[PDB]
């Protein structure tokens, strides 16, 4: 499943031996090498995944403020139940980590969008910090003038 053809992030050239495009979304990226050990990558992979899956949903939180241009016992219990629940959830996911050609497409695409939310979900707050203003309108509200 090797190819010198994958759309590298930096064209001509970008080939780290560990990355090969065998994985989905392999745009040949990792100068640091932040995973040159298969134990290193196999973990990073799962890590870069779950994150994305979450970030997407986070995005689904940016979907709600445009539909309209927080608890019955705030935090506390709401968290413990969360801890107790996502625990067991993430629990088993942990135990699994240590124990068709069509699908590649889906998964390559899944990561990239997923990559987007994180950069996204990120952006909306380091723009919100220090700078008390919502992003809700900014798309064409800040487009009025730089």
């Amino acid at each position: 499943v090797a190819e010198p053809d994958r759309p590298l992030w930096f064209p001509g050239s970008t080939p780290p031996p560990w990355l090969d495009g065998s994985l989905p979304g392999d745009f040949g990226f990792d100068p640091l090498g932040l995973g040159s050990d298969p134990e290193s990558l196999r973990w990073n992979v799962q890590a870069e995944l779950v994150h994305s899956r979450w970030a997407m949903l986070g995005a689904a939180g940016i979907f709600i403020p445009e539909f309209l241009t927080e608890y019955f016992t705030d935090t506390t219990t709401l968290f413990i139940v969360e801890l107790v629940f996502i625990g067991w959830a993430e629990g088993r996911r942990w135990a699994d980590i240590l124990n068709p050609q069509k699908l590649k497409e889906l998964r390559t695409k899944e990561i990239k969008n997923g990559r987007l939310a994180m950069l996204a979900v990120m952006g909306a707050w380091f723009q919100h910090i220090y700078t008390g203003t919502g992003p809700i309108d900014n798309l064409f509200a800040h487009l009025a003038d730089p």
């Binding site: 019955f72 016992t73 506390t76 219990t77 413990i80 088993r92 942990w94 135990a95 240590l98 124990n99």
Partner: protein, 195 residues
């Protein structure tokens, strides 16, 4: 039998021969077989909690509506005696002393199954260190086998149950049952989180 965690896997010491085996010994205390045979005995005797935890719980809820007027379990120091307290300790000690050592021998060599002063009579007929049949089992129930795993499992919960009782008492300043019912005053706000 089962496993406490799907990965990690059971140790070799936890064969499954013992009732209540679930491959849970992350630290490694019971790894030396002599070590187990002792901790197996300790788990049963500690576990058999049950007797007490039920002893501190049930009479507290029999005094629920006013059926009995007995003091709380943590208020029963005095004068719950027709002979005063200090009398009772010595009686409790001296004789428990006797029972405990005899029980002790059976752990090293079984044992002391026979009667003693008795001039012309039977003796306990049994096998197995942790469980002795005989009047200990007058009904003559089934030393099976699953119950042996039932016995444990219920004792283990009782233990955790005791740990709950004592802790909770502190902070919740009162009865483990008032406690229990203060939570029921429409919970979702009546949580340990409060304290």
């Amino acid at each position: 039998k089962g496993e406490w965690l799907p990965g990690l896997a059971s140790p070799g010491y936890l064969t499954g021969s013992l009732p209540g085996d679930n491959g849970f010994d992350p630290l490694g205390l019971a790894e030396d077989p002599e070590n187990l045979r002792w901790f197996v005995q300790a788990e049963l005797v500690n576990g058999r909690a049950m007797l007490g935890v039920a002893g501190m719980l049930l009479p507290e809820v029999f005094t629920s509506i006013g059926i009995i007027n007995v003091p709380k379990w943590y208020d029963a120091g005095k004068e719950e005696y027709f002979a005063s307290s200090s009398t009772l300790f010595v009686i409790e000690f001296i004789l428990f002393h006797y029972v405990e050592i005899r029980r002790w021998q059976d752990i090293k060599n079984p044992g002391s199954v026979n009667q003693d002063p008795i001039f012309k009579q039977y003796s306990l007929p049994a096998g197995e260190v942790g469980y002795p049949g005989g009047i200990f089992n007058p009904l003559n129930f089934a030393p099976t086998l699953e119950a042996k795993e039932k016995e444990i499992a219920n004792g283990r919960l009782a233990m955790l149950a005791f740990l709950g009782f004592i802790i909770q008492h502190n902070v919740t300043g009162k009865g483990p049952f008032d406690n229990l019912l203060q939570h029921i005053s429409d919970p979702w706000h009546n949580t340990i989180v409060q304290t």
